[PDB]
């Protein structure tokens, strides 16, 4: 009703509902509008609407898209968070001509920054993955921004519970595959599977039989296959072992992962050798997951 | 050539059920889909809300699915029907290898260039 | 309006089965008609040769509950329903049986015909 | 006082069933009467076309136990009771069956009629 | 007019059962409510004293099929439906159970209350 | 003496049942008599019409031999006008075919004297 | 009044059984009390030692919730010092697992007042 | 010495049963004879009143296996044996049934009489 | 009077069985004692070697019903009775079992002894 | 062409069994024919004496309809072949009451002196 | 050659049982013969008086007997033992063809130049 | 005197089975020994290869009832008996089992050996 | 000699199945192998994908002893053969408790390019 008058609509950004760029007429500014058709899934959907909209009203981080309002029209609903044109991150990185341990530490830092914020806000993302990681602009020094969805949740303090089975098979923690209560930690485990791809450009776990992929993910079976991992600082490999910890209670918190700087200090102290092969594999994986996923 | 497409979308459907991928399952199903199945206790259930329960709770034990003697009836360029026998080799609580048969009928309808199930009928053991 | 056409040819079908009229039943069925039914013992039978045995060899009241119809163009439809059957055994007592039925109709040369059907429950 | 009227139309109903009088039964039932019963195999049957078959088809004895009547205003009531039936099975041995019956009466055009009834057991 | 009005208090009943809130269930039931149910073992049990044991001692999904509402004036209604419940047994195996439910609602002082309940035939 | 009286009227009751004599059985039973028995399917029947069915159809037709045995009778006297007998009733009979069969039924008979005559106000049977 | 008295002592009996209180149950039962119940396997047990086993082992251990319902009580008064109650006993309980179960038992209690106090001289149970 | 003397009255007992002669059976049994048998349904029945029903209402072949005799002085004996009976059922089909029998004999006034009988577990 | 002696040696017998005292049981049984029992699977077992196995192998309650004693002279008797046993089955639910027992006592060397016993049921 | 030849002799076999013609059944079977069938109770039967009891008694006759489903033929040289299929029989028991029965059958054919003969056959669930 | 004699007398025995010829049966059996058989209910019976009942009462319906896999142990020139599987095709009350298996052991002893059964053991269905 | 020899070698056999001594069992059996037993599922097994599985892979009290012996010369015998077995299941309860056994012994080079044996009942 | 050759490849087959060696099992089987077995629930299975589930899961291992009874071989030319036999398996279930199972098996061998391969096999009661 109200989004009809104040706003003007322009090109689509993405689809799933449809994302589209708009600009507010009254105080001229761009945003990005989720157009959620009035056909969602009766109830299970409407519940996730208000959850996503609430969470995003709460999440205001410099590294996370912030919402503005959520308007309900007749045959549609609109959610207006912050706009971007940056391309995907795993897409920008391949375009880079110099990729080093120090660019990867610059990423996981901003990442852990969005994560920590919300973990302090009693909310867990549960779906952490390349898709969900984007670049503010293509402009230099553009920021990584976490994409708030939608299998998301509000925990009580540090209390662990069973929030049900959600997320992507590769990005799923064992505590969730074991069908045990969980919490903020299931987010840290994702980052760890993310960092590992953020170095060598292939994932730590995978199998075509998904029953098997899950077994690895429940068994913590990953290793640092030579040569590609030989040129990698043992600090890098250290963080990776701290996130990729099977027991969530022993798992490095997000607060802890920022202080230990194989990122901040290896930004200061780590390997910059441009690894062109990793970058290539990376790009390939990306295309595959786009078509396969 | 026209039947190979139905084979493709059907195998994708059975893969989504086997891997417990409910989102891909919802994409290949019409929102107003009807189903006769042994889990419905002789009742006709409408929508996907009834199958979600099986996707969440029931679905990492090794399971193998076999498709025997498919038959495809083409009814234009937008509607097709496929009927087949589905065998499932699995492991029970005791780890013993087991096998189950199931007769299945899938009614596909092409909407917006995308085949979707409008109705399906399963019989035999669940 | 079109749903009542499928319902009409379906009622004509059920009555053609109840009277034992294999002629009209053959006219309403495609020659390559496939069938799942308890009489086939989990197998898929093709043609009308399997159903002839019943018209030839075989006080009944049939009831249809909650018919749903899926139209897929102007030449394809699919109807699903519950079929209750009240009959008498040789013992003479009234018995009731339930069977869930699915019929797949296809218009060919301006006439609906069954291409495939799937029944569960009462054998 | 108005309980023996529900009992009266209920006794005329049961007697109409025992005599196989479809003519009176139709008068006592609304045309759009719904029914749950074992003969329906868990399905909800509407109308009287389903109950007709059971009128075309020796000594039996019926006993009604613990009748409870709920009065809802002056044009609607509901009676629930246990029905025991003693009969003979072909070989002639005496048998007995239990049923849990619920009748829902409504007064339209100055006449009580069953709008829906629910049965459990035999 | 009041069919949705009946569905409202029916849904509130379902919510009172799901949350285990026995007080709300007491507000929506007549003090002399009678109930036939499989847990009664064929006996006619009166009052909420029998259901109490379940509100003080109790992952599922419920589906309502073929709801029929009978409006009997401005103070009486009766709803009947089929309830299918999907649950996980002690084996952790998916199981499903069917019930046929009949609720008899009476209006007193501007509120709907259950005066009789009849379920069959699964607990 | 009173024990013998209660056994006498009890054996007269069982004798009226074995012969299908509904008149004598009616005279020995209170009009408001209640009953628990397997034929009642776990219900408490009141009166005599429920047993009348079995007197008219089953027990009136009996021309085959039937022999009843009362094992271990126990009598509780509760004043001058009340008594209670419990016993094991074993019935030797011939089935549909000519094969001898035996049935056991635990029986409790509650006797109350009104108008100078003992009458059953309640009985309870188990087994078939 | 007397009907209420018999229902009172009956509910006190069932209350003593539900709590496993063998002392109160002993006080409400005659020493020469006889019994028919499924636990006796068609036999007539006499005394209280047969029920003592269930008081000591089964009913003393119960910490789980148990709710008893007395359906359709019928009372026969037989003089000032005797009465007889019959009812349907429905028990809601929790089994070995945490699953609610229901049991039905037809019960006949024969009450006799001695020393100004009602006591059971005989009872009869059916069903399990 | 008396083992054959016990076998004699045992054989006379078998003959009294085979001929249906209830008088001879009465002469060979104590008036207060007790009996456990499957027809007693686990109850201890006293006297010949129970066996009477069988002597007034009754192609077979009987075999006695492993007879054991216990002589207990000059006035008491006890014989135990396995009895196998071959008969023709209502189907006209050959059937066989096993029983384990124990007879307790007492001497009074120069004659052996059954004071207790125990059979298991086929009629 | 001489019935409570049969009852006495019978109670010492049952108590010897419940305590698992093979030593006393052997004294109470003749060496050539014969037995019919369900554990024998319809066969006649002689001696005590067969009963030994059942002494090597918690709270149970035994009730003896309708004991009948036949006295045969002054050196032989026979007691028959019904034995009810309440126990607990692994899961701990109370159970009850019925048995029909017949003991045959004989006095040799001034001591009652079982020469043969017959059991039905459990 | 050869596959069809096997189909020919097989159809003649089924017709010979249905007609109760033991004469024609003998010609199409080797004198030392091997047999596994439920009528042999898990035993291996040699010869034609065993099936003669069924040719003489039962088949010598209410309406019966046979249906062959999913036939597969393996050709093993010029002189050897093997066919496997599902046999479904519709019949009537006592006062029909139409009934149906399934069996899984394997026939092993061998051409001896210019004539196909069964050397061994296997049946299940009949 | 020595085993063929045992085959002969054994086939004569089974022929006597099949034809219900009890006199020929008594000639081929020792008077003190012992037998374990399902009709004896796990008991050991001695003599021929126990089998006479089956010869008279039970034994004109067509019945066919098949002897599968005989094994003969020769123990001198006067004692032999044969063990075999016996199949029986018969007709029940409904006229339906039926079949029954039975494992049989026969212990032959040559007395006065004539083989006689001293003991036999049958198992399976009677 | 000779019967006790068969009984002796038979008791040595049963004890050789109870202890799991396949060596002495092999010495007491002919290499071409044939066997009928419930473990063979109605088939006839030859040699000792079938019985090795039990000595290798497999509180017991054995009792022998009514042994009968048939002597057929000075080099051949056959013993038949009832074998009762009192044991304990994994549940711990004492169980009893019956099996009728037939052993065929043949003296070869001055030593009795089993040529064939037939057991029925307990598997 | 040729009969013995069939026995050789058959024993190697049984040993390959027992050891859970799917590699050797693949060589001795035709890629389009036909199969009737109780694990297929009355259906005809083609290929080796179906038995792979049993090679991967179950057989990859407590003491098990196999016994072949009454083998019969039909030679049908130089390049074709068929063997039928009774397989008895002794094993242990959970906490044995030694168990035994019977099955009736038919193998159809065909020499292709100087190597015997199974083209079809049939199993009963397993």
From the CA of B95, how many Å to the nearest CA of chain E?
Answer: 14
Instruction: Give the CA distances from residue C109 to residues B80, C27, C78, C113, L76, in Å, rounded to whole numbers and listed in that order.
Output: 18, 13, 18, 10, 88
Q: Do A37 and A110 reside in the same domain of the chain?
A: no
In whole angstroms, give the CA distance from residue D73 to residue A233: 85
Closest CA to K79 of L116, L11, L47: L116
Contacts of A44 in chain B (CB under 8 A): 49, 52
DSSP-derived 3-state class of residue E60 = coil
From the CA of I111, how many Å to the nearest CA of chain G?
Answer: 32
From the CA of C44, how many Å to the nearest CA of chain J?
Answer: 9
Closest CA to M118 of M26, M45, M11: M26
Placement of tokens 């302090």 in the chain: A120
Q: Say if the Cβ atoms of E86 and B45 lie within 8 Å.
A: no
User: For residue A27, what is the domain's CATH number?
Assistant: 3.30.200.20
User: For residue E84, what is the domain's CATH number?
Assistant: 3.10.450.50
| Residue D42 CB neighbour total at 10 angstroms | 18
Q: What ranges in chain M are assigned the alpha helix state H? A: 2-18, 22-27, 49-56
Closest CA to I95 of D85, G53, M75: G53
Tokens of H121: 């577990």
Instruction: Give the CA distances from residue K121 to residues K30, K42, L98, in Å, rounded to whole numbers and listed in that order.
Output: 15, 11, 16
- Radius of gyration in angstroms for the set of CA atoms belonging to chain M, rounded to a whole number: 15
Nearest CA in chain J to C123: J99
Nearest CA in chain J to K62: J57
Q: Helix A185-200 to helix A234-243 angle, to the nearest 10 degrees? A: 150
Q: What ranges in chain A are assigned the alpha helix state H? A: 2-6, 42-58, 89-95, 101-120, 174-177, 185-200, 210-219, 234-243, 254-259, 264-269, 276-292
**Alpha-carbon torsion (A221, A225, A228, A230), positive or negative:** positive
Give Cβ neighbours of residue J97 (< 8 Å, ≥ 6 apart): none
Contacts of B42 in chain D (CB under 8 A): 41-42
Tokens of C92: 């003479």
Nearest CA in chain J to C58: J98
Q: Which of J65, J92, J95 sits opposite C90 (nearest CB)?
A: J95
Q: Which of C82, C86, C92 sits opposite D53 (nearest CB)?
A: C86
In whole angstroms, give the CA distance from residue A48 to residue A34: 14
Placement of tokens 């023996």 in the chain: D4
Tokens of L79: 């013993």
| Residue J44 CB neighbour total at 10 angstroms | 21
Q: Which of H91, H94, H98 sits opposite K54 (nearest CB)?
A: H94
Q: Tell whether J44 is within 8 A of chain L (Cβ).
A: no
Contacts of E100 in chain D (CB under 8 A): 36, 42, 44, 118
F52: left (phi over 0), alpha (psi -120 to 50) or beta: alpha
Contacts of H50 in chain F (CB under 8 A): 69, 90, 92
Q: What are phi and psi of C44, to 5 degrees?
A: -105, 115
Closest CA to G25 of G42, G50, G62: G50
Chain D and chain K touch, per 3+ beta carbon pairs within 8 A: no
Paired with B83 in beta bridges are: B71, B105
In whole angstroms, give the CA distance from residue D89 to residue F27: 30
Contacts of K41 in chain I (CB under 8 A): 42
CB H44 within 8 A of CB H32: no
Q: Which of E45, E54, E57 sits opposite G69 (nearest CB)?
A: E45
From the CA of E53, how many Å to the nearest CA of chain G?
Answer: 7
DSSP code of residue M28: T
From the CA of H1, how many Å to the nearest CA of chain F?
Answer: 40
Closest CA to A135 of A79, A84, A194, A74: A84
The total of structural domains in chain H comes to 1
DSSP per residue over M109-124, as a string?
A: EEESSSSEEEEEEEEE
In whole angstroms, give the CA distance from residue A237 to residue A224: 8
Closest CA to I117 of H102, H38, H10, H71: H102
* Cis ω for the linkage preceding M97 (within 30 of 0): yes
Q: Tell whether I63 is within 8 A of chain G (Cβ).
A: yes
Neighbours of chain M (3+ CB pairs under 8 A): B, J, L
Nearest CA in chain K to H61: K53
Q: Say if the Cβ atoms of G69 and E52 lie within 8 Å.
A: no
Tokens of M121: 């096999």
CB F10 within 8 A of CB F109: yes
Closest CA to M29 of M123, M107, M122: M107
Q: Provide the residue range defining the domain that includes G48.
A: 2-126
Nearest CA in chain D to F55: D94
In whole angstroms, give the CA distance from residue L116 to residue K105: 9
Give Cβ neighbours of residue F93 (< 8 Å, ≥ 6 apart): F64, F65, F66, F67, F100, F101, F102, F103
Neighbours of chain F (3+ CB pairs under 8 A): D, G, H
Nearest CA in chain I to G38: I96
Nearest CA in chain H to F94: H57
In whole angstroms, give the CA distance from residue A258 to residue A281: 28
Q: Tell whether I30 is within 8 A of chain L (Cβ).
A: no
In whole angstroms, give the CA distance from residue H67 to residue K30: 23
In whole angstroms, give the CA distance from residue D22 to residue A122: 69
From the CA of J42, how many Å to the nearest CA of chain L?
Answer: 9
Q: What are phi and psi of H30, to 5 degrees?
A: -70, 145
Determination technique for this PDB entry? cryo-EM
CA A271 distance to own-chain centroid: 25
In whole angstroms, give the CA distance from residue I47 to residue I34: 6
DSSP code of residue A143: P
Q: Tell whether L40 is within 8 A of chain J (Cβ).
A: no
- Radius of gyration in angstroms for the set of CA atoms belonging to chain F, rounded to a whole number: 15
Tokens of M44: 């005809």
In whole angstroms, give the CA distance from residue A59 to residue A119: 10
Strand residues in L37-121 grouped as ranges (E): 44-46, 61-71, 76-88, 94-107, 112-121
Rounded to the nearest 5 degrees, what angle is found at the Cα of D68, between the Cα atoms of D64 and D71?
A: 135
Q: Tell whether H96 is within 8 A of chain K (Cβ).
A: yes
In whole angstroms, give the CA distance from residue C70 to residue B118: 7
Q: Tell whether M124 is within 8 A of chain J (Cβ).
A: yes
Chain K and chain H touch, per 3+ beta carbon pairs within 8 A: yes
Nearest CA in chain C to D52: C61
Q: Tell whether M53 is within 8 A of chain B (Cβ).
A: yes
Helix (H) or strand (E) run with residue C109 in it? none
CB L45 within 8 A of CB L56: no
């Amino acid at each position: 009703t109200r989004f009809t008058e104040e706003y003007q609509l322009f090109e689509e950004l993405g689809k799933g509902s449809v994302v589209r760029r708009c600009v507010k007429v009254l105080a001229g500014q761009e945003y990005a509008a989720m157009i959620i058709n009035t056909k969602k899934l009766s109830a299970r959907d409407h519940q996730k609407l208000e959850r996503e909209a609430r969470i995003c009203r709460l999440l205001k981080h410099p590294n996370i898209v912030r919402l503005h309002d959520s308007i309900s029209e007749e045959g549609h609903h609109y959610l207006i968070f912050d706009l971007v044109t940056g391309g995907e991150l795993f897409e920008d990185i391949v375009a880079r001509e110099y990729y080093s341990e120090a660019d990867a530490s610059h990423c996981i830092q901003q990442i852990l920054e969005a994560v920590l914020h919300c973990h302090q806000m009693g909310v867990v993302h549960r779906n952490l993955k390349p898709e969900n990681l984007l670049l503010a602009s293509k402009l230099k020094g553009a920021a990584v921004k976490l994409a708030d969805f939608g299998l998301a949740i509000e925990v009580e303090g540090e209390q662990q519970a069973w929030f049900g089975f959600a997320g992507t098979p590769g990005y799923l923690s064992p505590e969730v595959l074991r069908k045990d209560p969980y919490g903020k930690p299931v987010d840290l485990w994702a980052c760890g599977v993310i960092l590992y791809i953020l170095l060598v450009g292939y994932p730590p776990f995978w199998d075509e039989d998904q029953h098997r992929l899950y077994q690895q993910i429940k068994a913590g079976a990953y290793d640092f296959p030579s040569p590609e991992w030989d040129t990698v600082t043992p600090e890098a490999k250290d963080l990776i072992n701290k996130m990729l910890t099977i027991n969530p209670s022993k798992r490095i918190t997000a607060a802890e992962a920022l202080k230990h700087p194989w990122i901040s200090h290896r930004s200061t102290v780590a390997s910059c050798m441009h690894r062109q092969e990793t970058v290539d594999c990376l790009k390939k994986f990306n295309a595959r997951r786009k078509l396969k996923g």
